[PDB]
Amino acid sequence: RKQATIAVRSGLNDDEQYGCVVPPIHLSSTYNFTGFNEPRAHDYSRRGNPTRDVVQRALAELEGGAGAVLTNTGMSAIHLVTTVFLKPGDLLVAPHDCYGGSYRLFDSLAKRGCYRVLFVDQGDEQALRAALAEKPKLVLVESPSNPLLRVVDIAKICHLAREVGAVSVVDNTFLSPALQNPLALGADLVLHSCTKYLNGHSDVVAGVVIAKDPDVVTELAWWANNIGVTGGAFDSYLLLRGLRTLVPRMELAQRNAQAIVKYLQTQPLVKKLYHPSLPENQGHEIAARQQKGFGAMLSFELDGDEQTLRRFLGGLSLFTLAESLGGVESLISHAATMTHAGMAPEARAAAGISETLLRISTGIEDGEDLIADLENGFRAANKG
Amino acid sequence: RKQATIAVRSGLNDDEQYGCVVPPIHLSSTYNFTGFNEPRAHDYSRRGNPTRDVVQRALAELEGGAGAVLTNTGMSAIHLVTTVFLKPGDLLVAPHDCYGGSYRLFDSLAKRGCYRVLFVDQGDEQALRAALAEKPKLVLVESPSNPLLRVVDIAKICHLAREVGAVSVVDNTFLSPALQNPLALGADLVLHSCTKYLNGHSDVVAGVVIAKDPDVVTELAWWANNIGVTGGAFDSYLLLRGLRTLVPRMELAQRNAQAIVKYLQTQPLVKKLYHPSLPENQGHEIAARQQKGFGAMLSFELDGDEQTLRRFLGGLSLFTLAESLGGVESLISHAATMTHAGMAPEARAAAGISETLLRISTGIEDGEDLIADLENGFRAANKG
Amino acid sequence: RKQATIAVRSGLNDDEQYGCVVPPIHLSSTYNFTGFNEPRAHDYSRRGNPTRDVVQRALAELEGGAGAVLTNTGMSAIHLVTTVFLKPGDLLVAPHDCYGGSYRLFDSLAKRGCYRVLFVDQGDEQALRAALAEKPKLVLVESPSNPLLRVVDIAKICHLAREVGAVSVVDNTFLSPALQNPLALGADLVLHSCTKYLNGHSDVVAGVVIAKDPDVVTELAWWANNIGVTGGAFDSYLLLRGLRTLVPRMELAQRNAQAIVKYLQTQPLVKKLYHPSLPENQGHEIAARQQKGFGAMLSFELDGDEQTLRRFLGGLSLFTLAESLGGVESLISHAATMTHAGMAPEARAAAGISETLLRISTGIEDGEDLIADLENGFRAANKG
Amino acid sequence: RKQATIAVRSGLNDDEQYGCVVPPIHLSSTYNFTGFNEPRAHDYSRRGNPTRDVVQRALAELEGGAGAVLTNTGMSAIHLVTTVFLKPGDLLVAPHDCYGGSYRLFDSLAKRGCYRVLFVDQGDEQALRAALAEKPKLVLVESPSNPLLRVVDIAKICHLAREVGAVSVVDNTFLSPALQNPLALGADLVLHSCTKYLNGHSDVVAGVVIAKDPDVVTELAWWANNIGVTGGAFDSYLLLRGLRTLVPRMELAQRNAQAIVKYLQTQPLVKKLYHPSLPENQGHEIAARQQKGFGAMLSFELDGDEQTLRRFLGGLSLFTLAESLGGVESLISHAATMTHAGMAPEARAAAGISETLLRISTGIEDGEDLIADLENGFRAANKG
């Protein structure tokens, strides 16, 4: 069965007692024993919960993994994976342009001696080769990257990692299982911040780690319980509900993004445009090869200054100025003051992040309405 | 004024837009800015959420702390504290009889070199002083302990700790802020598995860390966001709801526990009985001095064999055989088979845990109803 | 089992598939067939829902009835009963001082010829008898009444109504099953606005109709499904959750009320006091006879003009000025502008409701704290 | 603002206090006054609720109405409209083939004399016009009809209805606002069971009545509060969440429906097919003219007997045998034993409802997978 079928039906008719099509929400923190010294499949929600189990199976199926571990946030899924595979003295190799939260977590802990971290431009074969020569225990890959949507060869990185015996984990948040499948590309693990596209409705905060090896699933589950990062039952339910429309949401959002990309290619005030589909985007060839779609995330550089930017923004009404991405509603953010405000000004410029770069998480509103709304912003930027 | 008033009214009327008496559930994962580079008090749920903020204030207030950080599980509240206060090379002194999850966590990470752990009998003055001489960075106290309900001097232990420069954190789950206040006894932090008494309804899994120092709150908050362990908004809602009846719940449950002890004090089949109110109970006098009540948890050894055990249990119907405690419903567990089945039989015995020891988490059903139920249990225990 | 045991254990361990102690929330609107022409116990939520079934069982049991039908509001439970036992031509006899929503509903449909309504002072036997001679098909009793708390003889009225062939229904909202059981006093049915005391947490809106006769239950169930007033599954879950602490909630709210009553008796600014516990209170002897407690609701007339009352309310802090009652938090209401705002001053006065009468819905905050707050209001009232 | 833009953004950023993008869930049953006699927009949740308001505005906007009243069920929305526009002596003209629940409701109350009802074949000019000449106060239209998908001329019926002073209401559940807009076709009111397509996730039960005249919205709102059929806050939240994806869901469901129709037209075992897009389908010219799409509901008569039907259903695995429709998951039902089981076979026969008619509520799974499943059922229908 195709991904559209899996997303819609996985977990349906789970209820064996009442014949409910949609599974109930098992909020119970505990479960009675069948008899003395005879517990059932679950004995304590923190360790195992029936509702979390259903969504874990659905997410594992969508990525083609053996099983999944749902965590309470995407950041705790990242913390779970690093906790399991790294101890003081061990080395982690991560992308030089990875998610700000991820960088901050690794940096903060490595600065305490908890483990070693090496940030590398994984697109640079020489740089990458040298990092892997240091024999890391874990290699994190994140593609496309934010906010320039730069793409790196997942299959190649995972292979080189496997060559030196490092476990590979791919943060597939930006494209979701509907537009990219890292396990099918050679990764040992794939994780997501379910807070984004998977839930798709901006009202659930959760993370997940999916593994190709069932023994690794069990190890992850063991550690998730041990440090207490398993996800809640209610969030599990809403996440599963959001998942039901994952495919049509991703296809329409992507279709909308392509329409916006095409329109922006004609705009004079668009100094630079970024999207995996653009032949000139860093790693486009790779994207065309390893992705099932180019994605709904995009970004562009407005020609002008801070007031031109404030003018542009002030002219919008269908894009909400806010953090995050992946929801059904269109959002816009200014990297220099939002996603990368925690990055040194010189660094941002050093990272190729312009002070006038705006990133758009395309929603599923009508594409022409969204484009007409951008037209209004551009009209406003050009007025003095 | 009084804690009963705090639990009931904290958070009420928070709504300034619609005038709702009960605050709404703020599930939104993100928040809009008022203008470019002008965020509001909240920018991302994982970092800060309006509903979680409210329940944190209620919990802080209930323990007399400056602030609280709600985590997704009690275990992650313990992991958060250890993560903030220990780094490779630092030492943690924990109770030799602390909660199983706490023990397993500290042990598993200490084995990896993340930090050092020394498990000590904090009731053994000589043993305690020696460990503190190791100059730990953190000292964890957990009283009463489970399942023998032994009690230790929190005020003293915290004083000693502070002297050696160690930060003290007390796991107050067993009694809740309604029956004991560690901060009042000189602790730097008090934490609870809100999954227990605080929520009181067995349908929420959450943890919380409350600090005396506001600077410590800010730091615990930064780290909780960093490693991703902040609790959910929905759980925050149901938790605060459960909190509204904490005082009446604890009062009635304690009364029923006291009534059950009495009845048990006539059972030729009760080989031994444990409760902090009994004069022969380890640490009873300290208990009478630092606690506000003796608690709703109790346990007793069944004079007989496994067969005698299965029989007694088989004759109950108002006590559910299950893990956990703190809920309005009465539960019973067999440590050897549940709580401590992870210990070798001799190890359990060494720890003073009998193969026929039964723990009761007293609920708020009718006392007489509860005693009567036990009556039938014993009747069967006898029967050939 | 006693009330407290019923309220706490109803529904526990219902989950036979995963053994959840707390029943899961069955939100599913549809159920599958076990095969062709093979329905299940449930087929359509609007008709039958597993979570609604549980709470209906609990409520029927708390009032000692055969069964219950949970409706979406207290008003629709009232509308359901009238729809079932009245058609054009039939007569309904109701209390002259019944709930304002009940009055408005009966009046509004009577005005359209849907049925005839007769409002009588059921405390007046000849009047009561005269009305019963008209041969009503249904008689509604509501005791105590709002806001004066007048009490009438439920057993007597139900007795008289039964001999003329009228079905009796009692609105037991004000006292709840914990303080009064109309089915035992002779009624055919008892209904409540679960929105108040039963839920007790001001975050659920629902109603319930409980019948002595099982046949009447299937009747009410058929009609509730027919006109679509069945309660929702999520509300059913939050209501059952609230039900868990009904007994200690009523007990404590009741004690705080008596203490407050006692206090007001010593207040000069208190012109009149109203509480079933007071000998002088209308129907006091009947209350002491038919009630298991005198209730948590009370009202008093302030000695002074409007500015005096504003002053009094303005000095308060532990009572929220709002409609509704039955929550854990203490609420205060000015009948002339709130509960009875819709009623000419001539009608209000005629009905015996002062322009300075205040109603208190006692919560479970600390009693001393509550009185200390009233003292603040009084001090301000007499403050010039 | 196109419908996709409205469905996705209506109500977004409603929270002015915290700036939440997604509106929080207002469960609060009561609201405080900003002072004595200074109530707020909301004073009692059963009357007005902030979360119900948001979804009401969204539903109203999608149908182009002035406002909407959300009820607890689709049946109570139907009961609310008939309650407002009919009283004893008044006449209701309803579709001869309307929804079973609707028929039962009107029949049951007309039999008690609550009002008069006339079931007419609205596709027959003679019968339709003779009924309108009876001067009804209300005319209910339901197109397409279940389970044959017959379509009637809404603009024509509403035109003739207005001529005789009747109010027109259209039950637009089957197509939803995304595929049909009765107000734009001249109706006074449009109602829906939100339990179906609007919510689309089978975990909400709700109804809604949308009116073109703001004065009628007020009247319907007054009555909804009066008889207590207003929908719940939690349901309002989940329904709004479901609305977010209405357009892509209907589009895809419809697209799949067309692919299934095309396929079934090739099955020798399909002796009769029904779908509005079919040239020979009763009312096709009207459908093509008044609908924005032909819809996702379809039906067909299996060539064979009851054992054949059994074999066919048994061969399916992606279609759940269950009542209801409109969810993201594909469902199938056998009218004779499910939807119209309570219709004497003679009646079903006179109604053109075959004993082997199967209705399909097309979901959003991959269309090829669904077709393959169907082929499997057919290959099994042949093994006999």
Ligand SMILES: O=C(O)C(=O)CC(=O)C(=O)O
């Ligand atoms: O005026 C007539 O004869 C019509 O027949 C009008 C009509 O059908 C419509 O407005 O749909």
